[PDB]
């Protein structure tokens, strides 16, 4: 039976609506404050729940996060091991929604980067998958993924690199332990750059994109830095996505068509994580998964909160 | 050129002197409090530098163990990587010492379970060894471990299991990795517990310690759960120290004559341990190095502090 560890951050989101990403130098008014809950660990965990999926987050936060807890909680998600640390405050977001521009986030980790003393036991026995990112402590992703690849039977693994790691963090990344790869197209630019290919779809012209990308997949399967048992999911914004399994044939599939204006894609790609691992879980071919994950961020991308906008399974 | 790298801990230690450890539900007057430096990472590079290594300490203190980073800088230890927090304390080891007993420790992490966000690269470029212990989170142990036995050529890794590790970890440790064990009798019992044995050498009455602390070795060394690859160094106390490298005989040399009453026995393991490593990285060979070992140990069980009783090369 099916469940997922995610294993990752919590943030307060603050999003200060800007004309523009500010410049070096400037000062600017925000318009408006909108605070909503988020981080890549919360908002996956919330998408797995939403969809029908048994997930647990383990992770941090502060007192003044307890009320994103309780709305994990409210979904489904467990939080057995969302630990609450005193003097300590929860991870936030400082979001620049601009008004013509994409947005730009800064990080503060707080409670994302605690890790309690003594170091307990993590048993993943209950688990058969595991989502990680990039938002907590790099050595503590690194022993989840390597106790999820040595397990027997191994856990199905999927990371999504988010913030990006060092070029050397990316080549010496267990790849041999991860199932899935979970990336946009600039995403797989930056580890093909660091694994001293100079193909970088990150920079491809929209029409070219899908060829670019598809081609930057089978050169990153076949890259002496990476590993061959990965599999790979390169989201293509708008225009789709590209999922290959080793040694197949890289699938296209386009978005699915929007119902109502795009708002905020915050966490769009939390929510096709969340969605696809859910996927995974529901023992459903890898095709319909993806299908049902493009239904589900088309949804996210017309709503305003990370974790608010994610559908239910429908 | 040898380059030995400590990731561990740094502890401001308080000696509280009593008549014996308190017991549950007592209270009970100390006599006096000493504070002095100490923690596992700090006492093992200090001593490798008393020893006459290049040796670097990576770690965290807070803004009140400053004194303590320069007590190391004025020793030769490299603290570029020993961090300073702002708004956290330094690790703290409160010490029972007792007048007729083992003494009694109660760590408190604080600064030495601090990772600074974002998780930079770190590079083992410039290292030949490596020094781990179990004071500051598991998982950064784990890592730098790891990428210690995955360097071309690999590092020379020694660890000492203190505090001693939950029994899952033991049994998930990267044993592989790992070029040399140091621990006492005890902790040589608590392995081979997790690993399913009944040897427990830790139990041995003081005239059977060399026998059964040498089968133990054997019998560790053949543990499914170990690695074959791994050298162990298993101090006896005043009963001497056995040496093993995979395949080869258990040796035996016995403890230094004393030439000054026995004071304070704190950290005269980790004095071992850094004079052990400091022997690896001169070129010594194995029965040399460890006789100096037992000669600066000696010296050291004679004075007070875990870091100021850490002998010259003599």
Same mark, same amino acid.
């Given at each position: 039976?099916?469940?997922? /560890?995610?294993?990752?951050?919590?943030?307060? +989101?603050?999003?200060? *609506?800007?004309?523009?990403?500010?410049?070096?130098?400037?000062?600017?008014?925000?318009?408006?404050?909108?605070?909503?809950?988020?981080?890549?660990?919360? $908002?996956?965990?919330?998408?797995?729940?939403?969809?029908?999926?048994?997930?647990?987050?383990?992770?941090?936060?502060?007192?003044? =996060?307890?009320?994103?807890?309780?709305? %994990?909680?409210?979904?489904?998600?467990?939080?057995?091991?969302?630990?609450?640390?005193?003097?300590?405050?929860?991870?936030?977001?400082?979001?620049?929604?601009?008004?013509?521009?994409? $947005?730009?986030?800064?990080? *503060?980790? =707080?409670?994302?980067?605690?890790?309690?003393?003594?170091?307990?036991?993590?048993? /993943?026995? @209950?688990?058969?998958?595991?989502?990680?990112?990039?938002?907590?402590?790099?050595?503590?992703?690194?022993?989840?993924?390597?106790?999820?690849?040595?397990?027997?039977?191994?856990?199905?693994?999927?990371?999504?690199?988010?913030?990006?790691?060092?070029?050397?963090? /990316?080549?010496?990344?267990?790849?041999?332990?991860?199932?899935? /790869?979970?990336?946009?197209?600039?995403?797989?630019?930056?580890?093909?750059?660091?694994?001293?290919?100079?193909?970088?779809? =990150?920079?491809?012209?929209?029409?070219? %994109?899908?060829?670019?990308?598809?081609? =930057?997949?089978?050169?990153?399967?076949?890259? +002496?830095?990476?590993? &061959? $048992?990965?599999?790979?999911?390169? @989201?293509?914004?708008?225009?789709?996505?590209?999922?290959?399994?080793?040694?197949?044939?890289?699938?296209?599939?386009?978005?699915?068509? %929007?119902?109502?204006?795009? &708002?905020?894609? @915050?966490?769009?790609?939390?929510?096709?994580?969340?969605?696809?691992?859910?996927?995974?879980?529901?023992? &459903?071919?890898?095709?319909?998964?993806?299908?049902?994950? %493009?239904?589900?961020?088309?949804?996210?991308?017309? $709503?305003?909160?990370?974790?608010?906008?994610?559908?239910?399974?429908?």
């Amino acid at each position: 039976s099916s469940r997922c /560890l995610v294993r990752g951050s919590v943030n307060i +989101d603050e999003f200060f *609506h800007l004309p523009h990403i500010v410049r070096p130098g400037e000062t600017i008014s925000s318009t408006g404050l909108t605070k909503r809950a988020g981080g890549k660990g919360a $908002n996956q965990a919330f998408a797995v729940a939403r969809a029908g999926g048994q997930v647990e987050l383990d992770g941090a936060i502060g007192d003044d =996060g307890i009320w994103v807890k309780e709305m %994990l909680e409210s979904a489904g998600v467990g939080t057995d091991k969302l630990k609450i640390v005193k003097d300590e405050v929860t991870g936030r977001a400082v979001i620049q929604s601009a008004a013509d521009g994409e $947005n730009s986030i800064v990080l *503060h980790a =707080g409670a994302n980067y605690y890790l309690p003393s003594p170091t307990p036991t993590t048993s /993943l026995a @209950t688990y058969t998958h595991l989502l990680v990112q990039n938002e907590v402590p790099l050595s503590s992703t690194l022993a989840y993924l390597t106790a999820a690849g040595q397990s027997s039977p191994p856990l199905t693994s999927v990371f999504n690199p988010s913030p990006m790691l060092t070029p050397a963090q /990316l080549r010496e990344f267990p790849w041999k332990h991860l199932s899935w /790869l979970i990336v946009n197209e600039g995403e797989l630019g930056d580890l093909l750059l660091a694994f001293g290919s100079s193909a970088n779809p =990150g920079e491809a012209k929209e029409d070219e %994109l899908q060829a670019k990308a598809s081609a =930057g997949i089978l050169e990153l399967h076949e890259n +002496d830095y990476f590993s &061959k $048992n990965v599999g790979i999911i390169c @989201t293509l914004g708008a225009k789709g996505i590209l999922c290959y399994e080793p040694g197949k044939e890289v699938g296209y599939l386009p978005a699915a068509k %929007l119902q109502n204006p795009v &708002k905020d894609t @915050t966490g769009a790609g939390d929510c096709f994580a969340g969605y696809f691992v859910a996927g995974l879980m529901s023992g &459903k071919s890898l095709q319909d998964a993806l299908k049902t994950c %493009l239904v589900a961020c088309g949804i996210c991308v017309e $709503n305003e909160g990370a974790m608010e906008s994610v559908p239910t399974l429908n």
